[PDB]
Enzyme design. Sequence first.
Site, PDB file in Angstrom:
ATOM      1  N   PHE A   1     -28.814 -26.733  10.469  1.00  0.00           N
ATOM      2  CA  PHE A   1     -29.830 -27.678  10.217  1.00  0.00           C
ATOM      3  C   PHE A   1     -29.482 -29.229  10.972  1.00  0.00           C
ATOM      4  CE2 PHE A   1     -29.813 -25.030   6.387  1.00  0.00           C
ATOM      5  CZ  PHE A   1     -31.334 -24.656   6.232  1.00  0.00           C
TER       6      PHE A   1
ATOM      7  N   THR B   1     -29.850 -32.210   2.908  1.00  0.00           N
ATOM      8  CA  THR B   1     -29.483 -33.620   3.249  1.00  0.00           C
ATOM      9  C   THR B   1     -29.468 -33.452   4.932  1.00  0.00           C
ATOM     10  OG1 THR B   1     -27.213 -33.182   3.045  1.00  0.00           O
ATOM     11  CG2 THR B   1     -28.047 -34.416   1.409  1.00  0.00           C
TER      12      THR B   1
ATOM     13  N   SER C   1     -24.836 -38.053  11.876  1.00  0.00           N
ATOM     14  CA  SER C   1     -26.339 -38.402  11.370  1.00  0.00           C
ATOM     15  C   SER C   1     -27.280 -37.650  12.196  1.00  0.00           C
ATOM     16  CB  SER C   1     -26.530 -39.831  11.290  1.00  0.00           C
ATOM     17  OG  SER C   1     -27.866 -40.275  11.189  1.00  0.00           O
ATOM     18  N   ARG C   2     -28.052 -36.885  11.735  1.00  0.00           N
ATOM     19  CA  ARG C   2     -28.878 -35.923  12.558  1.00  0.00           C
ATOM     20  C   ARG C   2     -30.076 -36.770  13.116  1.00  0.00           C
ATOM     21  NH1 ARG C   2     -28.480 -30.999   8.121  1.00  0.00           N
ATOM     22  NH2 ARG C   2     -26.034 -30.649   8.647  1.00  0.00           N
ATOM     23  N   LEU C   3     -30.427 -37.804  12.584  1.00  0.00           N
ATOM     24  CA  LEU C   3     -31.526 -38.739  13.191  1.00  0.00           C
ATOM     25  C   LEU C   3     -31.004 -39.992  13.603  1.00  0.00           C
ATOM     26  CD1 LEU C   3     -34.384 -38.264  10.313  1.00  0.00           C
ATOM     27  CD2 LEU C   3     -34.046 -36.962  12.673  1.00  0.00           C
TER      28      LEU C   3
END
Lengths: 129, 457, 129, 593, 593, 51
Positions: free
Chosen positions: E235, A95, A121-123
């Site tokens: 990640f 995810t 939230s990575r983006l």
Amino acid sequence: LTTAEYLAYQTERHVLTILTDMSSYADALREVSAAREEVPGRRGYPGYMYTDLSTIYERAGRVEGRNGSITQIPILTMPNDDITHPIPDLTGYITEGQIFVDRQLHNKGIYPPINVLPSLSRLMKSAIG
Amino acid sequence: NTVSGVNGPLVILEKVKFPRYNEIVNLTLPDGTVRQGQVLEIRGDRAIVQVFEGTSGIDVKKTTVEFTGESLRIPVSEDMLGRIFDGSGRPIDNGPKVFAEDYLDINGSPINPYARIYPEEMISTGVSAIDTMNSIARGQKIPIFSASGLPHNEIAAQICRQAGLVRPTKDVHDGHEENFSIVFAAMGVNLETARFFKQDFEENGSLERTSLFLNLANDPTIERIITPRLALTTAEYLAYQTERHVLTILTDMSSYADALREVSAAREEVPGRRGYPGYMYTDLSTIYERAGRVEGRNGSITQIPILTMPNDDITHPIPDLTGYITEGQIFVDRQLHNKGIYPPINVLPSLSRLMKSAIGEGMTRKDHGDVSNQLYAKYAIGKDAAAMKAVVGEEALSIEDKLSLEFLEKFEKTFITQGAYEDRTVFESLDQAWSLLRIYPKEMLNRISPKILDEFY
Amino acid sequence: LTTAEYLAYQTERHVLTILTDMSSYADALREVSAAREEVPGRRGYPGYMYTDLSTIYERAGRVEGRNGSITQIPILTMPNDDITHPIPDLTGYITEGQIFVDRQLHNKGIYPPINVLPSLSRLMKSAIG
Amino acid sequence: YGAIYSVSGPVVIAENMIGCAMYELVKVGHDNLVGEVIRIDGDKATIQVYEETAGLTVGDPVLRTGKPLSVELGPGLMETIYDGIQRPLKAIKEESQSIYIPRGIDTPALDRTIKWQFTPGKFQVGDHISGGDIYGSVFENSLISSHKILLPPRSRGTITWIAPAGEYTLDEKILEVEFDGKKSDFTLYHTWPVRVPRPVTEKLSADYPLLTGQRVLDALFPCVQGGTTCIPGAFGCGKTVISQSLSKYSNSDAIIYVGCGERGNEMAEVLMEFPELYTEMSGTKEPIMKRTTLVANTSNMPVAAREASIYTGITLAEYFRDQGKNVSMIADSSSRWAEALREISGRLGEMPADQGFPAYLGAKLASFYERAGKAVALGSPDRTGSVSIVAAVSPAGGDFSDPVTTATLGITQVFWGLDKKLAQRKHFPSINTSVSYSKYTNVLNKFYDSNYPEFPVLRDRMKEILSNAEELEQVVQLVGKSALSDSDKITLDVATLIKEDFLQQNGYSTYDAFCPIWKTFDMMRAFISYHDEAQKAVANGANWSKLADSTGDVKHAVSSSKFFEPSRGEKEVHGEFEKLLSTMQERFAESTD
Amino acid sequence: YGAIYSVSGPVVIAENMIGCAMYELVKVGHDNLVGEVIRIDGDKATIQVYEETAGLTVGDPVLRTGKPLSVELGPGLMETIYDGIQRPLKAIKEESQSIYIPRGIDTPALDRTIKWQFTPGKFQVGDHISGGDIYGSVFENSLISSHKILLPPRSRGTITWIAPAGEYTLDEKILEVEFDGKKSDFTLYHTWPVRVPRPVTEKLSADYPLLTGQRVLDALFPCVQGGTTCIPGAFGCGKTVISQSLSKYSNSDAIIYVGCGERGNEMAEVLMEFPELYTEMSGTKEPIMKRTTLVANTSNMPVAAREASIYTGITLAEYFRDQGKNVSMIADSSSRWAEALREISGRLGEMPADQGFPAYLGAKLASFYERAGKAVALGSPDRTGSVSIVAAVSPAGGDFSDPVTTATLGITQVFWGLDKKLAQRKHFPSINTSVSYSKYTNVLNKFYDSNYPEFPVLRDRMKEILSNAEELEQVVQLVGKSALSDSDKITLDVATLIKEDFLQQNGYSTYDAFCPIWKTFDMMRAFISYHDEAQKAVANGANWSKLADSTGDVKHAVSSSKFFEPSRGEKEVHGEFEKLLSTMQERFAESTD
Amino acid sequence: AFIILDEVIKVTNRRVNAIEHVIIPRTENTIAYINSELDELDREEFYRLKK
């Protein structure tokens, strides 16, 4: 998920898919096997628990033509408040971030009680405009 | 007949019942390749074999067998010194053809004329850190216990280049009387690591007095287990015939254990604890028995196997079995490496069972052992007192304790720090120990008798 | 146990059976099922280990005539020392409370060394008057 | 005969069997490898062949001996080194031209080349006889008969003929016993199966000290003859050191040393070491060794031997125990014996118990410790004997909660812990009162009180000094020593001295390694007198630093005391310890005021 | 060929196999799902089928492809996106009109309608030829001939047919080799098994000097080619950002990017961004993409294709190594590769081992790294090529105690840490000398020492300054700044500079985007030069405050070097530094006086 | 106030050092020891069943 991929591709609509409860789906998967020659992994949950998660995960992303989309928010319930429990760990790797909701804030009486303390939230930048 | 099936590295052969146990058979593949295998199991008109060559690509009726009729033995010769081998005894750098003067089967028990008189002479590499705290006798086995993030390879290298310079000095003292040879078996190591070892033997001029067996990890798992054993059969031959002290360096033990584990979860035996073999002990035991003095009583096999913990613990199934079989361990620590101490061998739980036996008085002092007892105690308490200093400050730190803090620093930066070309001798180590130990009062120094203490403070 | 039941029923007696050592009894059960078709569950203990304990435990209680009874004291040594080990864990459930002896008191130089903190009997109040 | 059906690993299956027990001894092939029938599946019996194998043809004869695996009980086993499958290692050196046993070989279990001296008994013609009766004796030692020859159990009758005094061979018959016609003729040696414990008339409660020779063992928690001991390892145990001590110092008549699949160097140390050291009562014929018989096995030597080692050793012990001899049986190490069961369980394919260690480990282990103890000797004569079982164990799990350790802890009577930190400092063998017990201490201490020692009071005071020290030591590390008072500051210090001086018994002397019951008492007395005087002196007005400074020289003298020989003063009760009492008393007056 | 007997779960079992080998790729049923033969029992083969078997039946044909799971290495490899078993993704996007490849649809492993212009090499009819010899070349780049057509390994002979220069199809032939009759025809593409490593003349210790164009690798602990490097991920710690940087900035011939079984959002970025991005060594024609061959598996793609992935990329790199080119292998992430193995075992009922993770693990991870390395290229010209392996690892149980991360750190001699913190602060990569080591370092710096840079001396002194500083920061916390001298304060400043200049980057200029060896060298030369004089001057009667006010202009200039051109002094040796030495000397005269 | 402040800071300083060095790593090592046994009980069972 299949119904959604058709609305999203052919008639171009942005779809948000809400899937609750991934923990019950996971249990079913652990549950089937009782005459199979297939053995599970850690905590009784499959070694192939990855594979099953992935399966739901494959229907999620931008559709071809890309003004429609299929947007997925799966909902996972920790039964014992363990983040080292096999279900969240495998999912978490696949995810693009995670939302953590904690018991403490619900207790003060805040509702919804999303502590935004380890949520990410990575983006994050990538979405806004 | 021909091959019925293959399940993993096990090959299911259908063939008759006439072969013997560990009888070689040969598989004729339709690919223009021959592969050798040895019977692991014999059953009613079928056999289950582990192949040394390949692990896959085995057919049904395209693949046929012819049985060799000869059980697995090593052609062990003594003119095997300076020749280079791989993990099966084929040349990879065009070393001399194996020949034969005797054949010994591999079973961990060739002729087995191992010890019933214990070792008592002393071997020194010139490393104080090793020698003083762990007195290596001429047929004891003491492994090197290290962990990831360490230069275990570098220390194994220190031993190999510095051995064969110290030993003629020791020859005069009557620590030795005879030549030294090194038999190096590498298992499952990188090209880069393998070259390093070979570089060290060239560099010194002991390429003619060493045997090198190189097994890489990308060579079959079945080839890898035969590699330490092959080295050991040879080693026993050199000891027997030409009466030399053979030091065996068997690196790395974890690689070997990973091989055994794949042939025990792919076996119809259920493995032991933590998915590591139930006869894992046994497999390790096979190496370890092959230690001590060999008939004619002037050759011996001495063993230093090299273990890196792949999980950083002595909790793990590999350290715990390893340590029970051997007689001590030489411990390396992470902290010391990080700081800039080389060799980074720590002395906190490093221990020699046969310390007493190893020290003498016709080539070592008798005070080697007494002074050892002080160093182990003092260092041990000192390390613990330092951690304690951090917590408490100076409000539970005594004058005497300050002295232990000084002994600790000095031991670390002098006793343990020496370059990879620095050679010591036993007498020097004792003298330097005596000095450090000197600041402590007479009362403090209580595990050593007044006779000794008074003469040498 | 059977002889105690005869004592309690026919002649209206107060019977105390002292049954030592349950741990030895548990092992014996465990050694079997190594060639039975019946298969062993958690920590290699049979799953019908509970069933075995319960047969032993059954003769215990007031007999009919209500002038006799059989009181039963089983003796368990924890072989591993923890109370979450299979031998104690299952027994504590079938019984109504537990009595804890402890190593720590023994060390100081106490006899009989009895810790009372996890020790509770949940049917204590009602019986007594 | 049999026909070999399958050779799969060390487990071998052969068809066309008949008879077959479940411990029946078989020889597989013409090679004659050691095996035992484990199971039967159909007509085919499954045998684990425990000897090495690299050249066993499938379809060879398998010969039954017709009987279970046994040991020979009779003269000339003493001062002899064997493996657990009973082959004279000494003979194996001569024949084979190899020290260890080569595979494919087998040879008789007793040398049949020697003659032994029969002296009459106490059973003449027409006396009734029943097993364990002392028919005669054979001298093997130069002060005692180590082998008194008994009629084997479950033999009885009236003796028609006793052959007269003289030398005979051990193959030679010298007895005829009548029961139901001519029963048989008898020889000096008789067999007995190792899986059958030898009978006894009655068991007696233990009450007679095992003198362990070691201070730390006598002082902290004593053992008794008839005892059971468990010791956990981690390779800082110093098992060979304490085992070597047990052989020399223990006052038992006989000692059976058992190598359970060991280093092969350590068993070699204790064989060589015995003739160099001297007996505790004079005699030479290889001193210590003359009373010592060895079972020696190595790790990758036949597994049947390793497995049989504790059984064969304990049966050896039981024989001497029925003869009415006191025996110290040292098992080193049973965890490698238990490991063998892990291996067996794996090869067969049967499912294991906890952590891959089988469930039959606990019951088998429990039978074993139960065959030892103090007893009244089997037979009509009536004698007293003992078996003291001392067994080392080890983890392989890196914890103390593992099956092997746990199953022994359940059963064992005396427990001598292992504390890794002390051992890292070196204090072989290393113990605290919280990790160790002897349930036997109470009854032992009353016995020691009769002997001279002030022993009871000293046992309670010893526990108490260590127990208080442990609690305070946590408070010092984390909080500081600032909270503590000067008496409790003393508690750490007296206790430290006891750690270094008692526990450490590796030495470089036999005075720093042997501490007699009397030497152990004086030392403990001297040290407690210090502690009591010390808590008072600070109490009526003195410092921990000031007190420490005044005793000073006198403190060093008690530390170094241990090095000094025990053979002086009255016996081991020196004048050196007696004068020291007065100097403590004097010091007390100075310290306070 | 075969007939299906049973299909149980994902596994298909098929009878009438008299010639299926246990590595063979087969197409099962009429749906032609991909499958590979795991085990064979008897005439029945066990196949794990990786692509959905809903629709599949029993009694259906099983048709072999006639070879194992392999990759085809042909021309036209650049500017293509593949799967790990290798099938063009791009051709499926056009044709199927679906981005990903769905069940039952298959395509040849490379496009086959493509034709290439083949030029001959150095061979001619009737000459002897061997493996690794250049038989011709194809251009794909306008920088290099990416595809040198080599004679296939496992092939040698005399060449009966040499086609000349001209344009040929992939299907069409150009070579025939006679080697025991006609050996076969050959084509531009050659086949190679994934798990089998290519043969090479010899492998050598990793020492070949090239940059990755990221300064901090080189400066802190020399970057190696032919190396092995592990990097910790999680990640969203910025690992993905440094991978795209690492690929662009490099001056290596090709980069091979392996997305082992990734998010798919990260794979999308590499497809699009790399053609947007421009070379740091010049070249048009989709710049980064033209140098890059892309293997992309997302985490949802068949467990076989993800499993093959790491092997397939390293195969393409090794082949090119044999060509005499330097290739960089960038894999994200071996934790996803490990996970996949767990999946397969579990689906078969093959027992895994430690932590639920396969027994197969250790040996496999090790097999892979040994393929990577410096070698002298296979064939008769003899060339040097190298393959540098960088693998990300990440938790596989939510801990770093996972078998995978700990197994790889053992195999590798380079460890480079990666942090969330430094990435938020805009330092990319994130390597510190406390969370790293490189043991390859001694050989590299030595190599550098030759060329012109004073590299070895400078580098040891750099490590030490950052280490010593950490310790000096701890004092600032507890005591403060009232127990630190001018000389300790100076250590802090130098350390801040080293960190600023090397570690912090973000692509500020086209001078951060690429940096040569020389600019790295000049930076550290300047910092040490200041360090020795400054400390010397405070010893001689100066103050840190004094040093600071006078230094002013020269000190800001060395900090800003990273924005400016290195081309000021010459063309890649920086003038801003060379003048600095003179000014710093002059500075010091004024400072002392 | 100063003299007291001087004594209290010394105690508060000892406590931080103590929790950091001793307490936290004890919780790590104990947790780990138990984890390793624990996972193996679950795994071996599945192998027993399969056999």
